[PDB]
Ligand binder design. Structure first.
Ligand SMILES: O=C(c1ccc(Cl)cc1)c1c[nH]c2ncc(-c3cnn(C4CCNCC4)c3)cc12
Length: 259
């Protein structure tokens, strides 16, 4: 009823052809057509994408199925799992991510599902945020276990800074290939986030002092003492960032590895 009155009219096979099933998710099934097409909470997802238009957010085009811009570079997931990123490369991705979060938070929107799987890359090195299926001071236990802030896990009145935590977990993936406790169960991971809070790196000695600082400001247990997207954009670590072209050899490596 509300849904039909938002979505455009017509057969979703009248405007688009060459349907090649690229991915599969719990949310739906992602196809390519160049555009990308997927097939109460579904209403919230569409409206959020329409009103919050930033170059650091995957551009929403139309609905009937959802139609978006196609980012040929793939997901940050293949880069974090198949390649080794240098600190400059990690800083470049973090800066673009905080630029997406800054824009969302300022416009009073919490993402709640920040992870590498929701980071799409352009063939030019562009870093863009997607999946607003979970977006919303707040009190519902929503997200992906391994990326959830402890206050979300423990069922406390959480805010926009929960996205800063998951970004800190996403920095761990960039370093190690996986979020902390990925070997464990999603349920075991939940107990571990609540009981341990700040996760440890397997090899912190390998990181620089600024990168160790940026990580501790993303993963601070005290919400007030944890950084905001505005605060972290001016961080020392973000100054060592590389141009976004430094990410295109990473994209080339992930394509070759996942073939
Ligand atoms: O998924 C959505 C999306 C759809 C609907 C909604 Cl409401 C939100 C988001 C994409 C939107 N624009 C995209 N641009 C590129 C890709 C992409 C490139 N490569 N790949 C991979 C190929 C191998 N299998 C794993 C995925 C996926 C995916 C999307």
């Amino acid at each position: 009823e509300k849904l039909r009155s938002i979505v455009s009219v017509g057969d979703p096979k009248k405007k688009y052809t060459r349907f090649e099933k690229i991915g599969q998710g719990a949310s739906g099934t992602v196809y390519t057509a160049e555009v990308a097409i997927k097939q109460e909470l579904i209403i919230n997802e569409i409206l959020v994408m329409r009103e919050n238009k930033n170059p650091n957010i995957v551009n929403y085009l139309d609905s009937y199925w959802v139609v978006m811009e196609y980012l040929a570079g793939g997901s940050l997931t293949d880069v974090v799992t198949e390649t080794c990123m240098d600190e400059g490369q990690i800083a470049a991705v973090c800066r673009e991510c905080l630029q997406a979060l800054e824009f969302l938070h300022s416009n009073q929107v919490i993402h709640r599902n920040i992870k590498s799987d929701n980071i799409l890359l352009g063939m030019d090195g562009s870093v863009k945020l997607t999946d607003f299926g979970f977006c919303a001071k707040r009190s519902e236990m929503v997200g992906t276990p391994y990326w959830m802030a402890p206050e979300v896990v423990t069922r406390k009145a959480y805010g926009p800074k929960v996205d800063i935590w998951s970004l800190g977990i996403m920095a761990i993936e960039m370093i190690e290939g996986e979020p902390p406790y990925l070997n464990e169960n999603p349920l075991r991971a939940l107990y571990l986030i609540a009981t341990n809070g700040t996760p440890e790196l397997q090899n912190p000695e390998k990181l620089s002092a600024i990168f160790r600082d940026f990580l501790n400001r993303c993963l601070d247990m005290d919400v007030e003492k944890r950084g905001s997207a505005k605060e972290l954009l001016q961080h020392q670590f973000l100054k060592i960032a590389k141009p976004l072209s430094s990410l295109t050899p990473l994209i080339a490596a992930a394509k070759e590895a996942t073939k």
